[PDB]
């Protein structure tokens, strides 16, 4: 009542990474550096099309009042049952070979179902993911590569099979399985604060 | 790349001690097993024996046809395989091969790729 | 112990036919087995594992298959120089076994 704030504008495109068509694959997760805007997270919260919203940073009610340096939005597709692997700490296959979170990750992990859009009549063999690697992954590091993997013994000089397995494997999304085996589209919103001035945070409400 | 060689053969009377050394050149020795096989002339190859790895003490998986005649030892220091035989026999005049054996990960079916050149054993009084 | 049968000791015919070789065993082994190739004057090499997937550098003409205790290795429109002795081999995951193959004779 005592204070006034300027007219709202410049709502940066969260839809461009949410309502978009394709989310690439987990082994090549994109990275959108959203900055210089005023993102109204409320709509991303108050919606019935989002399944899991288990945040790990700040309470998802004041997030529209904390201004950070910039917010990184990652996006990819995963098996249904693995939606709980993105959480910090928990290990598995995609956790330590395709995507990992740091110990003190301070963002949020949106996920939702897309079985009606990412599976053709007989299923799509288009979404790849990693299943082998030399060792685990440090937080937030892509691993785009194709070099052949060796598990038992002997090298793999541009060969395949018998301890030269192809590092990437397809999912095989058949639109006739249970939820656990259906394609979930997942987005990770990681806030970042830095000595540089902040420029991204929710709108300041207005009144007469 | 990957290489394998054998040596230590000879032409001796039955009874004399004999050593066969198979040397593996430049793939790995300490993280894989190793096997020995027989290939008699004008005949199909036959099992001889394999041993385990990682200096666990050895499994001494001696083959049935040559039970209680030969012994195996993986010298990890020099990364080689030593096969010792004492009582030679005429029926044992067969080619000898050393090979790499280790089961896969996905299917888990043992097989023996990357075979050696072979060592010829001959006995004639 | 383990035993197996390798009746097809010699099977060759006009070049370009659908040659095949059988491998039968009395006991149960599942998919723990392999097939090798040996050309004259050279040590045998590694071609087929698990009776399903070939090995790198092997033309896809070779085709192994089967189940349980009976398996077969065939070839469609066999290529030149394929003539060689093909050996069958089995593993029980503890015990080992080989089998006499076929010495394809040029005719
Ligand atoms: C996607 O489009 C629908 C259409 O009504 C809209 O309601 C929704 O807000 C859009 N997505 C986002 C993230 O805004």
Numbering used by the authors:
A (entry chain A): 325 to 532
B (entry chain H): 1 to 125
C (entry chain L): 1 to 107
What does the literature reporting this entry say, word for word?
In this study, we created 494 monoclonal antibodies from patients with COVID-19-convalescent, and identified antibodies that exhibited the comparable neutralizing ability to clinically used antibodies in the neutralization assay using pseudovirus and authentic virus including variants of concerns. To gain structural insights into antibodies and the SARS-CoV-2 spike, we performed cryo-electron microscopy (cryo-EM) analysis of complexes with the proline-substituted stable spike. Accordingly, we performed local refinement to improve the density for each Fab-RBD portion, which allows fine modeling of the variable domain of Fab bound to RBD. In this analysis, the Fab binding location to RBD is roughly classified into three locations.
The third group, Ab159, exclusively binds with the major loop of RBD. The total buried solvent-accessible area is ∼1180 Å2, the smallest area among the analyzed structures. Ab159, Ab326, Ab354, and Ab496 exhibited similar or better neutralizing ability against Wuhan pseudovirus than the therapeutic antibody. Similar to the results of pseudovirus, Ab326 and Ab354 were ineffective against the Beta and Gamma variants, and Ab159 was ineffective against the Delta variant.
